[PDB]
């Protein structure tokens, strides 16, 4: 959803490299969501996303 | 004479084959006779393809064969159309060769490719509509050049050396595809082509301007560059004013040399059949102008 | 230490989206009714449509401003891979062939082994000399130049 | 390019831009009119920006340990130095995750 | 084998179909198991047998 | 000389009101890039091998790091950078 | 037996120019015979505000400078295509059975869809061209705030 | 096993433990030659380093 | 098959008159899109100070040819001639035509009145000349390429002086040199060295391949070839190879032949049939 | 990567440190700390 | 998870950034590690040499 508006064709090597970087960063950021953070606003934003 | 050609089948047709026919519209198919009405046996290249008689024979037969586009095909009526010179046509490519804008197209027998299938499409019990490859100029002239080099080198050599030589030579990559020549065989056709090539090379060695033999060496004394390093490296394996100079002699000698070169050149050049100016972004079809 | 200093220059490319403000009736557009042009062929016909829109700028001074609003990714790797000048200047060779081969062997740059139309075209004019990388995890290789 | 202020800035809007094809794994010059040109403020400014660099892993490790904006300081040792990032770029991009 | 001609000829339900990514991006990267694409007007649909 | 009432979002700021428009709705599922998603180039430069005068030599860090008394540390023969991802990157 | 549970179509959204907020930056005029023209001229009376000065300080005499603006052209183009079978079943209608009428209505509907898609393409192309001109006219934030 | 001189910085970030990165979402799809060159061929450089 | 072309620059009355005065000349455009910009119109997009004349010929071979006859409002109308039809064409080169001849397209070597200049972009049209003149010009330029490498000794300069002037029916042309500042431009050097290496490599390889062909059906042609080869070796000399090396030589010879294909095969573009004191214009049948 | 040290000294320093001390990967002359990416052993398994 | 044991760091480019937070007596057993210390799933301290 974040990379949605860039690709209009079979992904170029750079495009899917960026996708892989986003995959890895977002995986490591939220691997165990409720244990690491308990802000009401942040959890609400995560759920709405 | 005929702007329309009607091909009819002896066999009963299934709706799957009718669907395949109506999908193959705008493709290219060869015809032996350029005639009003032909049976389906003499359509395609399955008629001529005996792999024992190698690629050179089939190329020689195909370049004499005439070409036609596909049309209003229906149940047991094909209605092929022969294109005339100069008009704009829609043609659907069938080989894996990528077509890019501005390239001129040539007709050649199909080569091998990686997926190893060869796709025995349209088998009517025995008859099987084998369809030729339409190839852009660089790759097609590469096929011809590699075949001629194959014939010129292979003579008087043992099969062991020739094994590595053909294993490197038979495989061609063009736009990152992987093709290989199906059947290199030394027929009388290739032998006569080599006779012409040898005579042409002898003539260009004979009548060439005397200074054009030594221009490379004068430039090598003048310059030192990667291009010229390779040029010297080729000639190295056998390694001031001119006392006279006359422009008329040079003009006549270079005219003769150009005649000899043009004689040697078209042993590799193929008479272009189509020139493209359109491409579908899926490479599946292009719009072309026909050359005769 | 070789005895001299090196200072590198690199270009990094970001992917951005911009916000621009524009003034009310900042420029006026003049358009006609669309005109069609036909191009008829055998299997299919194509119709070309064109509209000659033109703009008159009605601003004393600038009337629209652009801002570089938000960035989320860097297209380049921000790497340190230096620029291969042997690709940039392929025509050059050392005068002595042994020296040239030894230098190109030490720099790890492949010498062309055989003549082909591609190498002649590249030496004379140019081509896609540097191939695509094997795996390209980190985006676009940045041209890190050295002075 | 030496023209009046308005002329030089509107020229910088018009043509003073770079283009690089975003297909190859390395930076080739784009074919004319293929895709949008990339704008470059440094072309108008004629300046290059500094990037966080150090000549020893000790100072780099110290910057990594310093968790609050340590990348922006350009402290130095005996013959060893760090060049601070004048734009908070590295922490800005990495915020996106 | 699927007969796309029947799909194109028959009356169709008008849905406001939309998704986060791009049609050609998802088509090229094989989100859909079977697909057929052509880049113009195609006469094949008109003939019936 | 006739007007049609249509609804949009409007921001109010500095005694002027401005229309807000997100043109994403126009460029969906099409080949042409939306021009408002622009690329930007910035040039970065960094030295390596730069010698420091030792008559005016100085340190402001001694409490944070100390180095092995080696000739390799005295001469900055290499430099370190960060990649697109935050890891060290050695150049020599 | 096999099951086909439905056939679906995309009721894609339509876009217009004067319905968008971008038209507020514009000032739209229609001029059918633009193709007769090879010049666009616009005259401004930009009267200059000025301040009464002191005893004998040098100040401007002039009012109503008459700078002229020229139009910048930007045609937009898009092709749409029809096949021979479509034209055969559109115009040369057959007095035959229901299948011929099915093909008739299919050709009529494909021409309708092609024309509507081409009109929407013209609208989006007008928007794109206008925004491109706005971008090429608009200076960044820092320069305009400096001015 | 691991050479004595292996860079300590390799262990400070998430990396492939085999010493060479094969995050094959970056390699071209269905290209076996490219994938095997990336994973094994040491005449070409690694990825992520 | 029509193409419209729009100028980004600003036209004017005398500018439009100069534009229209070439009512039916031929303009080459890179690729046939319906709408193109004026930058694509002409050879101005290709030329530079480093290339040389040879490339413009090869690029003209693959560049689409187009006839122009109108000036509309802000755009120009172009028509692509089709095979088998007849069209009205202008005479733009320094030559005078005659009925029944064949025409070739060449880069312009001599020139001001054609110069439709807008923002230091110039409408440089190619040359339309009969095939013998095209062949003569190309051959003389290629020859003058050879004489450039020595160029110091007096007789070589006299020969170069003689090549520069070519006489055709009712005219004489001052053909320029292909070298500037005593340097030979890069494609000129490349083609000259390729032709010379083609001849040199054939001289070496002919003996081995005539022997290898002789083990087949020996004939009079191979005997005469062998005799000529011994004659050549005797005249030149008084001044078990690895398969891959041999294949390298053969492939190099063949690719060096390929690089020279552009100039040898002078292609025809038109055939003329009209005689005129109105010589400015002529009617032609299209070939391609 | 997982928090591990070559000596008990740096382990004692890590246990002395406050919240988020595990993510720093400092080194000594021949001894070093490798830091974990996710706060696994800082708060994730216990949280109470 | 992956972690090294027994690595040797370059002596020529050796450095420390913790001299103001920890100190060890001069002993080659400290200089050249042959052990790696770790945590359990509990907060116990663990050894592996």
């Amino acid at each position: 959803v974040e990379n949605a508006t860039l690709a209009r064709q079979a992904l170029n090597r750079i495009q899917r490299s960026n996708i892989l970087q986003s995959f890895k960063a977002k995986m490591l950021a939220t691997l165990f969501l409720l244990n690491r953070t308990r802000d009401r606003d942040y959890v609400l934003k995560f759920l709405t996303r | 004479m005929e702007a329309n050609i009607f091909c009819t089948f002896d066999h009963k047709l299934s709706i799957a084959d009718v669907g395949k026919l109506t999908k193959l519209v705008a493709a290219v198919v060869p015809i032996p006779q350029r005639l009003h009405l032909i049976k389906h046996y003499q359509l395609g290249l399955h008629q001529f393809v005996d792999h024992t008689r190698g690629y050179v024979r089939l190329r020689g037969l195909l370049r004499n064969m005439t070409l036609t586009l596909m049309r209003r095909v229906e149940g047991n009526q094909i209605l092929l159309h022969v294109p005339t010179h100069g008009l704009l046509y829609t043609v659907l490519n069938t080989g894996p060769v990528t077509w890019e804008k501005g390239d001129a197209l040539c007709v050649l027998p199909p080569l091998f490719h990686g997926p190893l299938a060869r796709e025995n499409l349209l088998t009517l019990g025995q008859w099987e509509l084998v369809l030729p490859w339409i190839v852009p100029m660089p790759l097609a002239l590469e096929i011809n050049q590699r075949l001629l080099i194959m014939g010129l080198f292979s003579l008087d050599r043992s099969y062991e050396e020739v094994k590595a030589a053909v294993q490197q030579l038979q495989t061609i990559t063009f736009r990152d595809a992987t093709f290989t020549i199906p059947d290199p065989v030394i027929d009388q056709h290739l032998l006569i082509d080599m006779k012409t090539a040898c005579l042409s090379m002898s003539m260009v060695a004979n009548l060439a301007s005397e200074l054009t033999m030594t221009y490379v060496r004068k430039l090598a004394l003048e310059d030192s560059s990667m291009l010229l390093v390779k040029c010297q490296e080729l000639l190295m394996r056998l390694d001031a004013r001119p006392q006279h100079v006359s422009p008329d002699d040079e003009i006549a000698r270079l005219s003769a040399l150009f005649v000899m070169l043009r004689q040697l050149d078209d042993l590799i050049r193929e008479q272009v059949v189509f020139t493209v100016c359109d491409v579908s972004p899926d490479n599946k079809s292009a719009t072309c102008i026909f050359k005769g | 230490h070789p005895g001299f200093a090196l200072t590198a220059v690199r270009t990094d490319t970001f992917e951005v989206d911009m916000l621009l403000y524009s003034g009310k009736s900042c420029t006026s557009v003049i358009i006609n009714n669309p005109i069609v042009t036909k191009e008829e062929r055998d299997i299919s016909t194509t119709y070309h449509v064109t509209q000659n829109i033109n703009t008159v700028d009605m601003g004393l001074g600038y009337t629209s401003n652009t801002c570089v609003a938000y960035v989320n990714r860097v297209r380049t790797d921000m790497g340190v891979r230096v620029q291969d000048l042997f690709r940039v200047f392929p025509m050059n060779v050392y005068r002595h062939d042994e020296v040239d081969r030894w230098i190109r062997h030490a720099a790890g740059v492949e010498r062309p082994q055989l003549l082909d139309t591609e190498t002649i075209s590249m030496l004379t004019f140019g081509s896609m000399s540097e191939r695509n990388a094997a795996a390209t995890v980190h985006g676009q290789k940045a041209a890190c130049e050295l002075i | 390019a030496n023209k009046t202020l308005f002329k030089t800035i509107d020229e910088y809007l018009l043509r003073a831009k770079d283009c690089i094809r975003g297909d190859t794994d390395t930076q080739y010059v784009c074919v004319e009119g293929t895709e949008q040109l990339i704008e470059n403020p440094c072309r108008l400014t004629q300046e290059a920006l500094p990037i966080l660099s150090t000549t020893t892993l000790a100072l780099m490790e110290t910057k990594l340990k310093g968790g609050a904006g340590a990348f922006a300081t350009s402290e130095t040792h005996f013959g060893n130095y760090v060049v601070g990032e004048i734009i908070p770029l590295q922490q800005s991009m990495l915020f996106n995750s | 084998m699927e007969n796309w001609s029947a799909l194109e000829l028959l009356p169709k339900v008008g849905i406001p179909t939309d998704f986060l990514t791009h049609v050609k991006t998802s088509a090229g990267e094989e989100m859909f198991e079977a697909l057929r694409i052509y880049y113009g007007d195609d006469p094949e649909r008109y003939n019936i047998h | 000389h006739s007007l049609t009432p249509l609804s949009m979002d409007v921001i109010r700021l500095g005694e002027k009101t401005v229309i807000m428009e997100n043109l994403r709705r126009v460029y969906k599922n099409t080949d042409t890039k939306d021009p408002l998603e622009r690329n930007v180039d910035l040039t970065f430069f960094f030295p390596v091998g730069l010698y420091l005068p030792e008559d005016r030599g100085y340190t402001t860090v001694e409490s944070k790091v100390k180095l092995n008394d080696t000739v390799r540390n005295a001469l900055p023969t290499t430099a370190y950078l960060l990649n697109r991802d935050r890891a060290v990157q050695k150049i020599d | 037996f096999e099951a086909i549970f439905g056939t679906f179509c995309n009721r894609l959204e339509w876009v217009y120019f004067l319905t968008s907020g971008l038209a507020a930056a514009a000032h739209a005029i229609k001029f059918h015979d633009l193709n007769k023209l090879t010049t666009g001229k616009m005259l401004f009376h930009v009267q200059v505000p000025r301040v009464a000065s002191g005893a004998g300080l040098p100040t401007s005499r002039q009012t109503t400078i008459m700078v002229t603006k020229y139009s910048e052209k930007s045609p937009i183009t898009i092709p749409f295509e029809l096949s021979a079978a479509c034209l055969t079943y559109l115009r040369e209608t057959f007095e035959g059975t229901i299948l011929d009428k099915i093909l008739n209505v299919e050709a009529m509907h494909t021409v309708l869809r092609a024309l509507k898609n081409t009109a929407d393409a013209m609208e989006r192309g007008l928007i794109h061209s206008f925004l491109q001109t706005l971008l090429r006219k608009a200076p960044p934030y820092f320069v305009v705030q400096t001015l | 096993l691991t050479p004595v001189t292996m860079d300590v910085n390799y262990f400070k970030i998430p990396n492939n433990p085999r010493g060479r990165a094969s995050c094959m979402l970056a390699v071209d799809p269905y290209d076996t030659e490219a994938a095997t060159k990336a994973i094994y061929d040491h005449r070409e450089a690694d990825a992520q380093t």
Side-chain angles (χ1 to χ4, degrees), chain E residues 4 8 12 15-16 18 21 24 26 36 41 43-44 46:
Chain E
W4 309 105
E8 187 146 23
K12 270 174 286 300
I15 58 168
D18 208 353
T21 183
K24 304 184 176 191
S26 58
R36 178 255 196 139
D41 190 32
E44 165 272 336
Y46 278 104

Side-chain angles (χ1 to χ4, degrees), chain C residues 29-113:
Chain C
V29 67
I30 326 295
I31 83 186
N32 57 286
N33 288 343
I35 179 63
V36 304
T37 303
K38 190 160 60 71
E39 171 88 317
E40 192 159 14
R41 316 171 298 209
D42 195 8
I43 290 145
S44 173
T45 308
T46 178
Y47 292 66
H48 298 290
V49 194
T50 314
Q51 203 173 15
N52 209 333
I53 80 178
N54 66 43
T55 60
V56 163
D57 167 38
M58 278 151 42
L60 61 100
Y62 300 111
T63 57
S64 51
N65 316 324
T66 68
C67 179
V68 184
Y70 175 78
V71 169
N72 57 331
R73 52 189 71 79
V74 56
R75 160 139 65 101
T76 53
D77 59 359
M78 311 182 83
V80 296
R81 289 182 281 177
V82 314
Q83 192 83 334
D84 186 348
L85 257 56
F86 291 98
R87 301 290 186 164
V88 188
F89 303 96
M91 283 291 291
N92 304 53
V93 292
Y94 288 83
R95 222 78 69 195
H96 194 277
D97 297 283
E98 227 162 348
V99 175
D100 187 85
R101 298 212 322 280
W102 188 97
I103 290 291
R104 289 189 208 263
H105 170 39
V109 51
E110 280 275 29
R111 307 182 88 251
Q113 304 287 299

